[PDB]
Ligand binder design. Structure first.
Ligand SMILES: CC(C)(O)c1ccnc(-c2cccc3cc([C@H](NS(=O)(=O)C4CC4)c4ccccc4Cl)sc23)c1
Ligand SMILES: O=P(O)(O)OC[C@@H](O)[C@@H](O)[C@H](O)[C@@H](O)CO
Length: 585
């Protein structure tokens, strides 16, 4: 029948209590899983949430039990990281005609950018021509925009690769898809394997290859799975590499911006920093060199969540300011300002939040007195502002902006990253009673700009912010158990998550779930055969423009009613959360 191909590969819903014995649970990609720790994240109070996420973040460093999937500390992952570092080095020793590209969609692309800058600086501060560049699905404006739909084209990915790789004779392409998912990277990786004489692709994400996305790509003949499998085959002969540790499911199912984003930095910063450090010392990179860095990153998790109680407060605030339809500002300096922006803009697609509910700010790029005029007038008693800076920053520029905002707001708090024995000028101190400071024990730093203290600082911030924004929204009832049900479908991945959530939550058959979801999307049009057989982009295109789609489809299924009857129910409820929740009992 119409729509069998389109949906052949979707796993059928299990009968009740079979979910584990059907073989389904074991088929759920790790990146999409329900993390058992967060089953009741929707009941947790603010301080628990922080524990829970802090604990979810911990899993990055958790070791492989005795049978199971390789992890970040496993010998095979470290051996691959060493080989890849080894291959970076061949390129480092020959900067003329060489290039290194870090490429991904969404937050994977955000990470690629942050990184590529730093390693450009490293080389620059040593007067070397920088060989790093990045690629973000949707071109460079994607870096700081919510643009979920751009990831779904493999040709786009390839065209942007060919742009950036024109003159060159040695290109290393680090393809980054947490889920081993994005058609953007799929194309690049494949392009590479077509031209190894020039190209060396390194796939990075956090599912085993056997869970890699197997869906038809609309402009491409192979799947991510096939590309990823072919890479793995080239790995013996060292012409491609797959770097894919399990780090455990996200605390918020499918939210790869969080642990997936962190692990991406932890993993690549490590390998690259080691690759550099060691060329200059004339030694081959070693499992022992990477391990230094990994353990430092692991310490940083302890250091960061050491401040858990002051993280929870800031959450309790960010949520209360949002509860009262107020706004939240995330002002920060340098690299940290950027992480501030990236997080605010991620709450758009993640939580169907307006660009303003969590806004981020660099000194988006508004310098001192441009932020005093432009933004400072229209704040309020109820808003929250967060300040994020090191004790190495223009702390004069800081105290100035905090001063004005104290009159216009009292719900300020702050994040400051200090080396040990660095002191907090007394004006600032008195402005923040219950401050959050992180002190970094001294480290025997090699290079010019102390990059390892950079990578530390960025990560620690991302953790805090990811945790705040994310838990804030939870406190507000927008999350259902540990799933975000009411997402805007803006690409094919999101479309599949929507459908898997309908199966999980209704527990009805896939065919019924598909029909209700596609009805929900296409309303007022009824299911025709064209619609049933349409490619997934066409559903996306139409859903992307609509509101409450997934909830309305779930309700149609629950009451076993039509869309018309489900809309009219949802309009007659106080809220969406409540309506869905009621219907689920
Ligand atoms: C936990 C929950 C809600 O049941 C869930 C949520 C999301 N996805 C699943 C799921 C279960 C079993 C298999 C697959 C496969 C998935 C997807 N593979 S696919 O697009 O080629 C095929 C489904 C259309 C997939 C695989 C890897 C990464 C992302 C995705 Cl969407 S998601 C998923 C389950
Ligand atoms: O790196 P992946 O699996 O290819 O995912 C890339 C993007 O879809 C992903 O970054 C998404 O934007 C984030 O909202 C996850 O919360």
């Amino acid at each position: 029948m119409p729509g069998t191909k389109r949906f052949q590969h979707v796993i059928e819903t299990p009968e009740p209590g079979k979910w584990e014995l059907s073989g389904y649970e074991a088929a759920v990609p790790i990146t999409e899983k329900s993390n058992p720790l967060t089953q009741d994240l929707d009941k947790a109070d603010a301080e628990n949430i922080v524990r829970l996420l802090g604990q979810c973040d911990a899993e990055i460093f958790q070791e492989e039990g005795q049978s199971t999937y390789q992890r970040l500390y496993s010998e095979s992952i470290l051996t691959t990281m060493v080989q890849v570092a080894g291959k970076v080095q061949e390129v480092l020793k020959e900067p003329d005609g060489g290039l290194v590209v870090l490429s991904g969609g969404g937050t994977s692309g955000r990470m690629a950018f942050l990184m590529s800058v730093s390693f450009n600086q490293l080389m620059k501060g040593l007067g070397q021509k920088p060989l790093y560049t990045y690629l973000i699905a949707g071109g460079d404006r994607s870096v700081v925009a919510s643009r979920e739909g751009t990831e779904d084209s493999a040709l786009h990915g390839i065209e942007e690769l060919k742009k950036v790789a024109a003159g060159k004779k040695r290109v290393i392409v680090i393809g980054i898809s947490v889920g081993l998912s994005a058609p953007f990277v799929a194309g690049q990786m494949d392009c590479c394997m077509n031209n190894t004489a020039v190209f060396l692709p390194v796939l990075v994400g956090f599912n085993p290859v056997s869970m890699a996305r197997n869906d038809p790509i609309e402009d491409w003949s192979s799947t991510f799975r096939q590309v990823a499998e072919r890479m793995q085959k080239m790995q013996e002969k060292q012409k491609a590499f797959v770097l894919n540790p399990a780090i455990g499911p996200e605390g918020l199912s499918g939210s790869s911006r969080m642990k997936g984003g962190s692990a991406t930095k932890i993993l690549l910063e490590t390998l690259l920093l080691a690759a550099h450090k060691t060329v200059d010392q004339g030694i081959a990179a070693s499992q022992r060199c990477l391990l230094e860095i990994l353990r430092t990153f692991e310490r940083a998790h302890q250091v960061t969540y050491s401040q858990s109680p002051k993280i929870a407060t800031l959450m309790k605030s960010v949520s209360t300011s949002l509860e009262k339809k107020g706004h939240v500002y995330l002002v920060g300096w340098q690299t940290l300002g950027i992480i501030a922006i990236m997080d605010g803009v991620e709450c758009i697609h993640t939580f169907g939040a307006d660009f303003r509910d969590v806004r981020g700010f660099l000194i988006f790029t508004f310098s001192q007195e441009d932020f005093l005029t432009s933004i400072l007038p229209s704040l309020t008693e109820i808003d929250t502002v967060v300040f994020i800076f090191t004790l190495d920053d223009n702390l004069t520029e800081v105290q100035t902006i905090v001063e004005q905002v104290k009159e216009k707001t009292n719900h300020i708090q702050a994040l400051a990253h200090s080396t040990v024995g660095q002191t907090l000028p007394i004006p600032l101190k008195k402005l923040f009673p219950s401050i959050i400071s992180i002190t970094w024990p001294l480290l025997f730093f090699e290079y010019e700009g102390n990059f390892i203290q950079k990578f530390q600082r960025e990560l620690s911030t991302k953790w805090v912010l990811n945790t705040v924004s994310t838990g804030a929204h939870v406190l507000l009832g927008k999350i259902l158990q540990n799933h975000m049900l009411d997402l805007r479908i803006s690409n094919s991945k999101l479309f599949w998550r929507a459908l898997a959530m309908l199966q999980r939550f209704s527990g009805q058959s896939k065919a019924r779930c598909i029909e209700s979801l596609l009805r929900a999307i296409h309303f007022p049009q009824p299911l025709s055969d064209d619609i049933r057989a349409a490619p997934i982009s066409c559903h996306v295109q139409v859903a992307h423009e609509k509101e409450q789609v997934i909830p309305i489809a779930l309700l149609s299924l629950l009451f076993r009613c039509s869309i018309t009857e489900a809309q009219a129910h949802l309009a007659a409820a106080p809220s969406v959360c409540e309506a869905v929740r009621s219907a689920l009992a």
